[PDB]
Design a protein around this ligand. Structure first.
Ligand SMILES: C=CC(C)(C)OC[C@H]1O[C@H](O[C@@H]2C3=C([C@H](C)COC(C)=O)C[C@H](O)[C@]3(C)/C=C3/[C@@H](COC)CC[C@H]3[C@@H](C)[C@H]2O)[C@H](O)[C@@H](OC(C)=O)[C@@H]1O
Lengths: 5, 234, 213
């Protein structure tokens, strides 16, 4: 669940 | 105090009070009253933030259910697994509707009525986001055609971002961050993920509109890169 | 794997996945037929009502802010939205109060079960007392009173959880820090004189109320 936007 | 000013304001009440599902319905009525006119920068962000919090909680619950399920399946306790499988199926059918609700809104009016390049990359990226969220749980033929629509919409957003928007433009940096993430977990290509997010990171450093907003993504880009490049294993 | 056992397992998935509204429903069927099940229905309803009340606090702050500035039209929208939020608080409290009244409180056999159910009655009535209020606080004091009358050490958690919930009802709903502190001080020192990780969690919160009151 790596960083995302 | 027009009806449009009524719903934009009432969306901030549901936003401030964490009533995100109703916040979506308010912004949905804002969009379903426009012909070829696009949303303002705030209205655009509102709807996207509204759907973000909705899909974010549904996703969180799905990851948790999948994790407990894979442990009970690892134990082989089948009478529990059949219950978690049924429960996850319920969560996934909601996600279908939630993505259907925004995708059929992006596909209907938001993307075609996008006039400026800022709105084009915006609504294009949004499509990839919710098509990528479908690829997280969907299996079989649906996953293939979901990542097809994720890769197709993310690519068209990159064409417009790399010729119209500046490298430090938030809509562009956020596009590249989601793009790299799609490469790493859905396509399992760390070099396709890193080369896109290294290229977009350094062009923002080289070029460097208030950047507090952009540097928030620049810290999340480099964080992603650095931890990936690390040899250690999740 | 009986049907009642599946509900306990199903509520865990709702409890773990932060999907609290369904956990009440899964535990609702189990009641219409243990210690963990008693916590299962309490915890599920506790987070459901906690989510709705927190929205009302910010809505009341947002609506009182516009009254201070003077926005009759903006204030009208907030008060109307607030009415829908309050309308939900009635239905959520109606289900828990009806569940305890019809079956849970009457079928309570042990003394530890009588205090826990009547505390939830006074708690869900205190939720009705925040926003009719004379009857709500009456049913809140009536529920909190008989729960104090009904035989255990102060360190036992159901007693300490009730004494803290009752001491807060007098401070905010009845505006009486004197009679409220005398209840929290009497309950706290009686636990220190007789003396726990579950009990000290409330003992640390009992002090946090008194030290700032
Ligand atoms: C409108 C409501 C709120 C949430 C208060 O707006 C917050 C912010 O909303 C926008 O910020 C967006 C935006 C964020 C910025 C990176 C940072 O914003 C703040 C307030 O710190 C965080 C969010 O994820 C949000 C809304 C979403 C996106 C996302 C959009 O996809 C189509 C990808 C990148 C990012 C874009 C849209 C950001 O520009 C604006 O650009 C910000 O203002 C400026 C000068 O950039 C404003 O502070």
């Amino acid at each position: 669940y790596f960083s995302s936007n | 105090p027009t009806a449009r000013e009524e719903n934009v304001y009432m969306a901030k009440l549901a936003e401030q009070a964490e009533r995100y599902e109703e916040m979506v319905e308010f912004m949905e009525k804002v969009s379903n009253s426009l012909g070829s006119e696009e949303l303002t920068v705030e209205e655009r962000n509102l709807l996207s933030v509204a759907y973000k919090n909705v899909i974010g909680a549904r996703r969180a619950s799905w990851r948790i259910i999948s994790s407990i399920e894979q442990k009970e399946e690892s134990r082989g306790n089948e009478e529990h697994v059949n219950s978690i499988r049924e429960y996850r199926s319920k969560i996934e059918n909601e996600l279908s509707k939630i993505c259907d609700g925004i995708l059929k809104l992006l596909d209907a009016k938001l993307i075609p009525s996008a006039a400026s390049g800022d709105s084009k990359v915006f609504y294009l990226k949004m499509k990839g986001d919710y098509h990528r969220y479908l690829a997280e749980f969907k299996t079989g033929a649906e996953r293939k055609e979901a990542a097809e629509s994720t890769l197709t919409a993310y690519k068209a957003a990159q064409d417009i971002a790399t010729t119209e928007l500046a490298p430090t433009h938030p809509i562009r940096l956020g596009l590249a961050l989601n793009f790299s993430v799609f490469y790493y977990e859905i396509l399992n290509s760390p070099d396709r993920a890193c080369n896109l997010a290294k290229q977009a990171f350094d062009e923002a450093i080289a070029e460097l509109e208030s950047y507090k907003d952009s540097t928030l993504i620049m810290q999340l880009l480099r964080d992603n890169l650095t931890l990936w490049t690390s040899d250690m294993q999740d």
